[PDB]
Write a protein that binds this ligand. Structure first.
Ligand SMILES: Cc1cc2nc3c(=O)[nH]c(=O)nc-3n(C[C@H](O)[C@H](O)[C@H](O)COP(=O)(O)O)c2cc1C
Ligand code: SF4
Ligand code: SF4
Ligand code: SF4
Ligand code: FES
Ligand code: FES
Ligand SMILES: [K+]
Lengths: 214, 45, 263, 432
């Protein structure tokens, strides 16, 4: 899947109604002013992401609108849209489960969590739910491998899961309520499961051993 | 006063809207400086 | 003046500072095999066939984009250079589809010639190859994108020479595909020249499509008359019949390009 | 004289005082710890002074580079040609096992922004382009409310800390790619183009983002800078060993009891590290079958070498591997090392940007042939072919992703050839 060739569809066509709210245009101005003038196409990453933030799935009309907003040729927008991850070019459910399966994450039987996702939703890897809520796909090492096999939905990490812990969060999102983004078994950020092997003392004080006239 | 060594206070990240990035980026825009000019407004000009 | 002395596999030459390594080698006569660098186009260092060994240097460097420095005997025929060329081409020539009898580039494929000169004589690819669906981009250019090597020459020609920035790349990894994403219509006045910049038969001439294997057609120099520019061209005629018109190098009239109307 | 052993770093000597989120990550807790202390004097002391102490401390590349920070930052001491000098900080952390940058940035962002301010003052840089991996949304949101608080306090911005140096910070998202961790691919990504690395030279020094002179850095690399600047290079030079000195935020995961990420002094043998902090490998030290050091790019090491080798770049080089980013991942006996490396190189194939031929083609070729190996469909000759292909990938790629994907294959072959042989013999026997 994930075909990098767009085709004219009634849902995704140049006609497709896409635009930005006035607040979205204010955000785009903020993105533009961050970068030096003359090189403004460099801001093509957030604004198009901003489109996601208001639409999720990005129609070809969204790419064309971003191209005309940033005064950049349309395919220069298409390239960054089709070369980076996320940037969903096909409609997806509002919730978007992403379970890492890389080696450090897989070692603690991440496949158990994967099959638990599958059995809870009935859907398989890829396809979204028939009710258009969740999207069962896998991701690479997103940067939370130090915890137990963990998943990210939209913009919420959950760490230190277990084939059991995912069930509650899944039917929480299915029920509408949001689970708390964080590890599911102690270990607030990354501390040892047994306890605190370090950082167990009050912190350093300002002025600790400096050379005074440094 | 007693420093609790087993608590987490990075909790405000839980209640973050989908626009939170740009929501305070727009406010931060005020505390900035003029960007340097490359001359031509576009590399295509 | 500022001419810096640079050796190439021995004998030394006078080289303008800022000159790439491959130009320095060309100053003597030996030529780096290449697929990504065109003399009148921007460099990208993409094919990695431009790799060569620098004397007393650990890793090979790309002769396409390498500002040559003091001394720097260019070991063109070093064993490490030959091994690097062999490996880079083995990688290039893995997913290449078995179309040489059916591809119009046959006999003047460049890739075939480099394989004859600097390449292996057997394939150890034990797995299945990759296939890319064709993207039509005109009645003027035949498109078989499974044969492409992603040398990015077409994209750079579209951006700088023609100026119509619609020919690009999509995706990543081995599934990266160079095309137009949208079924767009590349109809610039210089589009036909992409037929002559594509090293492989990924882009060919539709009107001439498989009319003659180019090892038969005699080549006769002449001048285009469709325009007052008078671009130098070569008529490829076999058996008393005109097959196609190719651009001739002049550097004062047409560089090495002609209009689609002329072609 | 020479420190006989290394380990059990002093708790007050740990740079990341809030690594576990035990302190206020905003301005108040940061200043309580000692962040933003003596900044004014630090800017007044000058780029030459800051570069002197960064050499004295002697930081090898904390972001899995190894190049000393001294000359790398001295590359931005030449007089300004007029182009706007910039500082860039990399925070991709897509590397299997990399979790330290995310933790520090969601827990100690003020130290990071203070590293950017002090470093950029040393660099002659107009402002900082702090690029955050797009998956870390809340982490970026936290760092930028911290940045806004600093701007309100006047520490960063015009006349930074009352010094006249007009440094600034720009929070940059990234639509997700491990190749974006590469410095030139990072330049390309932040330039709005694809995340394809550019060939050097032009080095990132003279030609960087938008053609302006820039210089990349790791989150940890610049984050440790302000503390060592306030304390002096003696603090960092004391811990660890020669060349490889100071401290590194080690990450531990895999088959360990407590897969945690902890700060510890530099050049420590693994034997202490996994057992004392991670509660030991599940099943005891005997159960430990292999350990990959910092980053999956570095080849895996059998247990016969890990227990003795220290965690320092030179020693891991002697151990036929690299130190990387201290992402120690441990695999026990029950782990199928072949399938683990299979998933790892599958990740590498998924992350290849496809620019240069060697990466784009050879990594996919490796994926297919080595998946066949994992299943067992192969002849004993193909091991040598895989080794030669790994050599072909190495050194011929524009960026170092090719090397980082070739090395795990080399380590797997070298350390577990007989396991491969018996796997394929069983595959030959099962089918008749
Ligand atoms: C494929 C690839 C991925 C990389 N990813 C990262 C990364 O996530 N973080 C990082 O700090 N450096 C990364 N690097 C290294 C950078 O290219 C650069 O050398 C490094 O950021 C310098 O860090 P330092 O300033 O601490 O020495 C990566 C390199 C490659 C080739
Ligand atoms: S372009 Fe491809 S199919 Fe055609 S001759 Fe060359 S290698 Fe063979
Ligand atoms: S289509 Fe032809 S010119 Fe374009 S990248 Fe592929 S081989 Fe090169
Ligand atoms: S090794 Fe080459 S093809 Fe692979 S990501 Fe790096 S530059 Fe791109
Ligand atoms: S392994 Fe799952 S995030 Fe790194
Ligand atoms: S010339 Fe070296 S890759 Fe194109
Ligand atoms: K051709």
């Amino acid at each position: 899947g994930a075909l990098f060739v767009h085709r004219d569809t009634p849902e995704n066509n140049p006609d497709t109604p896409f635009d930005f709210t006035p607040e979205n245009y204010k955000r785009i101005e903020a993105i533009v002013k961050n970068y030096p003038e003359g090189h403004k196409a460099a801001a093509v990453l957030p604004v198009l992401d901003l489109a996601q933030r208001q639409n999720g799935w990005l129609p070809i009309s969204a790419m064309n609108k971003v191209a005309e907003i940033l005064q950049v040729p349309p395919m220069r927008v298409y390239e960054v849209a089709t070369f980076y991850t996320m940037y969903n070019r096909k409609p997806v459910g509002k919730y978007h489960i992403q379970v890492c399966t890389t080696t450090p994450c897989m070692l603690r039987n991440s496949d158990s969590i994967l099959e638990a996702i599958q059995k809870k939703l009935g859907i398989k890897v890829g396809e979204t739910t028939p009710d258009k809520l969740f999207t069962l796909i896998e991701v690479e090492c997103l940067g939370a491998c130090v915890n137990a096999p963990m998943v990210q939905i939209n913009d919420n990490y959950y760490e230190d899961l277990t084939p059991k812990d995912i069930e509650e969060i899944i039917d929480e999102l299915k029920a509408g309520k949001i689970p708390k983004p964080g590890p599911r078994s102690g270990r607030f950020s990354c501390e040892p499961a047994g306890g605190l092997t370090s950082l167990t003392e009050p912190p350093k004080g300002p002025g600790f051993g400096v050379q005074a006239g440094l | 006063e007693p420093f609790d060594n087993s608590t987490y206070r990075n909790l405000q990240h839980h209640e973050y809207s989908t626009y939170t990035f740009l929501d305070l980026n727009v406010e931060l825009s005020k505390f900035r400086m003029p960007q340097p000019s490359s001359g031509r407004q576009s590399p295509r000009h | 003046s500022n001419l810096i002395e640079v050796f190439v596999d021995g004998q030394s030459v006078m080289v303008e500072p800022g000159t790439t390594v491959l130009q320095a080698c060309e100053k003597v006569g030996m030529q780096i095999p290449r697929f990504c660098y065109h003399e009148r186009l921007s460099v990208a260092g993409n094919c990695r066939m431009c790799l060569v060994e620098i004397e007393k240097a650990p890793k090979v460097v790309a002769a396409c984009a390498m500002p040559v420095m003091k001394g720097w005997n260019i070991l063109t025929n070093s064993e490490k250079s030959k091994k690097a060329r062999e490996g880079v081409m083995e990688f290039l020539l893995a997913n290449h589809p078995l179309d040489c009898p059916i591809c119009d580039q046959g006999g003047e494929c460049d890739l075939q010639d480099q394989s004859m000169m600097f390449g292996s004589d057997r394939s150890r690819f034990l797995e299945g190859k990759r296939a890319v669906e064709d993207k039509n981009i005109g009645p003027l250019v035949k498109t078989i994108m499974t044969r492409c090597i992603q040398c990015t020459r077409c994209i750079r020609f579209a951006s700088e020479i023609a100026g119509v920035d619609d020919l690009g790349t999509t995706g990543r990894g081995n599934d990266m595909q160079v095309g137009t994403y949208i079924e767009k219509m590349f109809m610039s006045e210089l589009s036909g020249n992409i037929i002559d910049i594509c090293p492989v038969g990924a882009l060919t001439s539709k009107p001439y499509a498989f009319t003659a294997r180019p090892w038969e057609t005699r080549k006769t120099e002449s001048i285009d008359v469709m325009d007052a520019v008078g671009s130098n061209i070569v008529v490829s005629t076999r058996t008393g019949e005109v097959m196609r018109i190719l651009p001739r190098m002049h550097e004062d009239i047409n560089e090495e390009w002609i209009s689609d109307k002329t072609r | 004289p020479k420190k006989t052993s290394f380990g059990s770093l002093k708790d007050e000597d740990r740079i990341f005082t809030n690594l576990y989120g035990r302190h206020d990550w905003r301005l108040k807790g940061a200043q309580s710890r000692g962040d933003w202390y003596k900044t004014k004097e630090i800017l007044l002391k000058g780029p030459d002074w800051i570069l002197g102490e960064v050499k004295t401390s002697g930081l090898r590349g904390r972001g899995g580079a190894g190049f000393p920070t001294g000359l790398k930052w001295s590359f931005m001491n030449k007089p300004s040609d007029g182009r706007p000098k910039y500082l860039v900080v990399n925070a991709d952390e897509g590397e299997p096992g990399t979790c330290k940058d995310r933790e520090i940035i969601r827990h100690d962002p003020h130290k990071l922004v203070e590293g950017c301010l002090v470093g950029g003052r040393a660099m002659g840089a107009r402002a900082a382009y702090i690029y955050i991996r797009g998956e870390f949304y809340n982490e970026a949101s936290n760092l930028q409310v911290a940045i806004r608080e600093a701007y309100e306090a006047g520490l960063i911005g015009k006349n930074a800390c009352g010094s006249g140096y007009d440094f600034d910070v720009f929070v940059v998202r990234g639509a997700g790619a491990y190749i974006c961790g590469e410095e030139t691919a990072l330049i390309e990504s932040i330039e709005g183009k694809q995340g394809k690395p550019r060939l050097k030279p032009p080095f990132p020094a003279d030609v960087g983002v938008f053609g302006c002179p820039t210089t990349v850095a790791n989150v940890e690399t610049v984050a440790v800078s302000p503390t060592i600047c306030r304390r002096g290079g003696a603090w960092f030079a004391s811990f660890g060993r020669e060349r490889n000195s100071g401290t590194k935020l080690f990450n531990i995961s895999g088959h360990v009891n407590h897969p945690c990420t902890v700060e510890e002094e530099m050049s420590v043998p693994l034997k202490e590290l996994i057992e004392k902090h991670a509660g030991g490998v599940i099943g005891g030290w005997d159960n430990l079958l292999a350990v990959i050091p910092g980053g999956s790019s570095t080849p895996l090491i059998p247990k016969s070498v890990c227990e003795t080798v220290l965690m320092d770049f030179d020693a891991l080089v002697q151990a036929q591997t690299g130190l990387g980013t201290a992402a120690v991942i441990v695999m026990d006996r029950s782990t199928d090392i072949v399938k683990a490396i299979a998933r790892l190189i599958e990740f590498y194939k998924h992350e290849s940007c496809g620019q240069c031929t060697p990466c784009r083609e050879g990594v996919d070729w490796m994926n297919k042939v080595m998946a066949r190996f994992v299943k067992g469909d192969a002849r004993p000759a193909e091991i040598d072919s895989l080794w030669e292909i790994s050599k072909q990938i190495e050194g011929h790629t524009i960026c170092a992703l090719g090397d980082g994907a070739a090395w795990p294959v080399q380590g797997l072959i070298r350390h577990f050839r007989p396991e491969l042989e018996e796997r394929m013999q069983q595959f030959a026997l099962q089918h008749q």
